[model samples]
Target chain A: DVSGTVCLSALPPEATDTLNLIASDGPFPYSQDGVVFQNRESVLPTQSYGYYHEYTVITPGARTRGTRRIITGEATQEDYYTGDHYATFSLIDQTC
Target chain B: DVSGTVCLSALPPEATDTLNLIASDGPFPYSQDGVVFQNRESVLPTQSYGYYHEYTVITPGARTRGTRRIITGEATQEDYYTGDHYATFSLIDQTC
Candidate 1:
């Protein structure tokens, strides 16, 4: 698998739902409401968390102008929210 | 650190709600309801909008099918709705 990644953008107003970054690598389609992990250290390539994949989004620099939305939830605030979720990114590409 | 990317797809039916694209990176699995930027041309990278990143999705062309949902919103339809959002892929990796 390891298909790649994508940045999600939302309307400042719509960023208020329990969302999931579900994806698929073909054969079948993937579905979910948001990403699930053991803790925050999910992008380290571990295999204890049932799945070795996670999710991500783009940041906002001067070059950016609301091109994307934000991930809404309580889990994405500590690590990546690292203080900057709008400018955060991650990897969730895996195999089956 | 700099992983790869992934493309998002909708059930064609699921692509009806207001969706946000979020992501994360190692050491701090990122989070956000959507991405916030200052302008376009953010693929190259910069640092000005409190962060240095943005969000993205996959485009609808060849090699890809029923893959990656079309962003839902009115603003998107004006801008990258710039032309397209379900085709142009961005970078959003998840990590710890």
Candidate 2:
């Protein structure tokens, strides 16, 4: 299986803005942001429920919260982005 | 009905350790400490999965994880410590 790792720089520009907002203790745009991401589909590595939080990545011209998101884990400085809800994921790598 | 709010000082000493250890990002003795608490009983509030984590307050010579635990909620700086597993809970008040 491919590692599924992706560079932060390669993501949509909106994703970069979203990550910075999170680092600053966000005043997130969507109410959906900062809510517990339950990981209802188990697409993420297992951890406590509150361990992960969801943030919406703005869509260039989409109607709403869009289908993209950046989920963060608390146990470590871990970030995972999904373009189609929880159907799939790409581990976000900051350095590369 | 009583408010069920319990002071940190009033609980068992081990419970304090569990709370403090959690505050320090624990090296929890039990692997179960950081796992998702399924809340099968639904005794707690409705939040996303992974929103709560259970930590064991080692029983003094009970030779097991014991029935006591502290479940923390990340939506707020909220904590609930239960003496009889999830049958009942006492909200832990840090300033009371």
List, residue by residue over B1-96, the lDDT tens digit for candidate 1: 112343224122222222332212212112432445434433323234434322223344545432442222222221121124333533322120
Task: Summarize candidate 2's per-residue lDDT along A1-96 as a digit string, tens digits.
Answer: 114899998999898999999999989899888988876544565456598899999999888878999989895658888898677888898887
- After superposition on all C-alphas, the RMSD of every candidate to the true structure, in Å, is 20.1, 16.2
For model 2, the superposed segments whose C-alpha errors exceed 4 Å read A1-3, B1-96
Error of 1 at B34 (Å): 29
The residue-by-residue lDDT of candidate 1 on A7-83, one tens digit each, is: 22322212211123222321211232234544454433334543422233333242232333322223333212112
lDDT of 2 by residue, B56-77 (tens): 8766535356789988889566
**lDDT of model 2 at residue B13?**
81
Cα-lDDT of candidate 1: 0.29
DockQ for model 1?
Answer: 0.09
- lDDT value for model 2: 0.81
CAPRI-style quality class for the chain A–B interface of candidate 1: incorrect
Q: Pick the candidate with the highest DockQ.
A: 1
